[PDB]
């Protein structure tokens, strides 16, 4: 009955002073906006239907039209920024926040969904949603003794919407908003549903992407052990944001990095550094690079867990982006490590794959590797073994590459390469 | 030497 209407038919029904005709026209609009194949969103907007849908949200006397309009507005807000803006300009934000208190679960859920789309557009709309006071009624919906009593889809939508309030930077979410959300976020992080867990980890990863003060807020909540536990999950959609979160945390201070190590995260890295999914392998190596940029006792933890041969393996064979992160892990290792630790790196066979990457057509990684070779030679000077190191580099074709790098297009590349030649060869 | 670093919108389908 309300299937495949024209836009003018929808306008005609909505413009009538008949609430039932309006309900039927609104449902027809919803079904139009629900077809996966190019929904006529711009046509609906140009017809000036948005303010009508928003007004229908306030009709507590007629819950079906509240639901249909909420669904319709949800799908419009799911589109482009201009389409989302059109929904916001219609005054939908405070109207949807009022619907969060609806006695009908499917209606309040739709309001949660719609606010999620609006907040997900960017920092501005995210903060505007917060300013309208969305956080309190959102969190109130999760104020139950046991989350398992809530409908599965209902809980998933709430978690997803909450993660959008944690999303985006420039600027990051308000500090007072993050502090208000965090306790609920921690509780969701201990739930048993994979999708809730995935979105909870994404939310945490968003909050940990920034200044160390932002990281500290999260770490203070004691979520690191749970993040490490989720790091060993079988579900890839859980491991990915959990790894991202852990990776963000170790970009902070040595003390914050230590929390990750103490939680036992390093024991998961043999799997992560050999993970079939390339992006997991890249972010794990990136995480390792920031850990090897820490204290010497933290570098020692990496050694004790037997992660150095895994770094050699990644450097030897991986996607190039992952190998680039491995080069960083090595340069950071050699920069801050003890002579004993640097010697161990060579004994594990770091030289050959390090030299093989000097033939990469990437200026930055060449710089990074040259810094590593430099730092390794410095450790050889303290032991009087620079001659032995020079031979190793000579035996694997490393000297040939360093020599040809003397005539390289970059300034510091040609500088460091020629410096290495005359100093050790 | 530290180096710093779920769809935003979803339509409801039948
Ligand atoms: Cl924005
Ligand atoms: Cl892949």
Numbering used by the authors:
A (entry chain B): 72 to 496
B (entry chain A): 244 to 248, 268 to 276
What does the article say, verbatim?
The X-ray cross complementing group 1 protein (XRCC1) is a scaffold that plays important roles in the overlapping single strand break repair (SSBR) and base excision repair (BER) pathways, and participates in other repair pathways as well. In order to coordinate DNA repair events, XRCC1 must be targeted to the nuclear compartment and to sites of DNA damage. Classical nuclear localization sequences are either monopartite, consisting of a single cluster of basic residues, or bipartite, consisting of two neighboring clusters of basic residues13. These sequences are recognized by the protein Importin α (Impα), which binds to the NLS of the cargo protein in the cytoplasm, and then translocates it along with Importin β through the nuclear pore complex into the nucleus. In view of these variable results for the XRCC1 NLS and the essential requirement of nuclear localization of XRCC1 in order to fulfill its repair functions as a scaffold protein, we have further investigated the structural basis for the nuclear uptake of this protein.
For crystallographic structural analysis of the complex formed between the hXRCC1 nuclear localization sequence and murine Impα(70–529), we selected a peptide that encompasses all of the previously proposed XRCC1 NLS binding motifs (amino acids 241–276). The Impα(70–529) was chosen because this construct, with the Importin β binding domain (IBB) deleted, is identical to that used in previous crystallography studies by Fontes et al.. The NLS-binding domain of Impα contains ten armadillo (arm) repeats that are comprised of three helices each, with the exceptions of: “arm 1” that, in our structure, starts just before the second helix; and “arm 5” which consists of only two helices. The hXRCC1 NLS peptide/Impα complex reveals a bipartite NLS in the structure in which residues from both ends of the peptide sequence, G244KRKL and S268VPKRPKLP, occupy the minor and major recognition sites of Impα centered around arm repeats 6–7 and 2–4, respectively. The major site structure includes 14 hydrogen bonds below the 3.3 Å cutoff, while the minor site includes 10. The more extensive interactions with the nonapeptide are typical for major pocket binders, and include non-specific interactions with the carbonyl oxygens of the SVP residues preceding the basic consensus sequence: K-(K/R)-X-(K/R). We note finally that a comparison of the sequences of human and murine Impα(70–529) indicates that none of the residues that differ between the two species makes contact with the hXRCC1 NLS peptide ligand. The importance of an extended conformation for the major motif is indicated by the presence of proline residues before, after, and within the XRCC1 NLS major motif. These residues eliminate helical conformations while favoring the extended conformation that is observed in the Impα complex.
